[PDB]
């Protein structure tokens, strides 16, 4: 959140917030409507966005669900969708927040060591997120899709 970021900076310089920082906060709190709207829509369609995104991912990345793949099997595949759901949720937190800090703190820091250990091909996880963006892109207004897209692109870029 921009409020926290501003407080952290001001505190680092042992001063109150600068008029510029306080103004950006004013703007932030008022221009929230469109972002909460976007988050709500993604939340409501979660089951569908993830389900269809999985389908796309497996079509483009069949290796992950074939003998030897990390998500091979009914249960393993279910776990894969569970992770996509985790990220979709994280994406909604980031959208309402106005930045990718919640996404970064809950699901990006250490993500490579986690998946590296599990044997999960992280680039494929990136693909599933891109897929969710795609599916989401058929539910959001071209503008809402454009704004939320920045968040999806972040997670995807970070998942490599």
């Amino acid at each position: 959140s921009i409020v926290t970021k501003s407080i952290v900076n001001a505190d680092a310089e042992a001063r109150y917030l600068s008029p510029g920082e306080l103004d950006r906060i004013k703007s932030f709190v008022s221009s929230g409507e469109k972002r909460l709207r976007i988050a709500q829509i993604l939340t409501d369609n979660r089951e569908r966005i993830v389900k269809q995104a999985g389908d796309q991912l497996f079509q483009k990345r069949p290796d992950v669900v074939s003998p030897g793949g990390n998500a091979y099997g009914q249960e393993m595949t279910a776990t894969c969708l569970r992770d996509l759901d985790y990220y979709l949720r994280l994406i909604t937190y980031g959208i309402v927040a106005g930045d990718v800090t919640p996404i970064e703190e809950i699901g990006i820091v250490g993500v490579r060591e986690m998946y590296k250990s599990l044997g999960t091909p992280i680039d494929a996880v990136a693909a599933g997120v891109s897929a969710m963006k795609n599916v989401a892109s058929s539910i959001l207004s071209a503008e809402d899709a454009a704004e939320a897209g920045a968040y999806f692109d972040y997670v995807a870029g970070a998942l490599a």
């Binding site: 926290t4 109150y16 917030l17 004013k26 008022s30 909460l36 949720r89 919640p102």
Partner: protein
């Protein structure tokens, strides 16, 4: 530290839930108090020195504390005391701006009671001073902003005793 927004996000994340109706209600309440908080902050920053000055005049000056033998005697100690008052004000303002007291625990109350007890800084007198700033700040920002700032002034106080 965390603000009111992040605080809600984290309460939902620990449950593994997407933000629901109530969570979303809390978020709106914060966003809607945003300009009032910024205003109060802008005012408080301007009156920073005056708030402390008056709080000190009201609770510490002309007593035993400032005379020889007092913990506020010697220019070095007087200055350190008002500096702390400055910190408390600034930090409480931060907390109010954020609508969350986590910054107070992380940056103010963290090892403070120990330092004061160790150096011999009278905890009670400090609490009186912080509370004097509460009365002073309230009369400047209005009852609403004053109530908010107050929860934070009291938060610091409670952590001292």
């Amino acid at each position: 530290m965390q603000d009111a927004i992040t605080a809600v996000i984290n309460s939902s994340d620990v449950q593994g839930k997407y933000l629901d109706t109530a969570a979303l209600e809390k978020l709106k309440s914060y966003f809607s108090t945003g300009e009032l908080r910024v205003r109060a902050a802008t005012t408080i920053a301007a009156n920073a020195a005056a708030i402390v000055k008056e709080a000190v005049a009201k609770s510490l000056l002309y007593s035993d504390i400032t005379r020889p033998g007092g913990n506020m005697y010697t220019t070095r100690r007087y200055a350190a005391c008002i500096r702390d008052l400055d910190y408390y004000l600034r930090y409480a303002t931060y907390a109010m701006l954020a609508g969350d007291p986590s910054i107070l625990d992380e940056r103010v109350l963290n090892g403070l009671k120990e330092t004061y007890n160790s150096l011999g800084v009278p905890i009670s007198a400090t609490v009186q001073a912080i509370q004097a700033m509460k009365e002073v700040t309230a009369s400047l920002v209005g009852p609403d902003a004053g109530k908010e700032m107050g929860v934070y002034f009291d938060y610091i106080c409670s952590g001292l005793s």
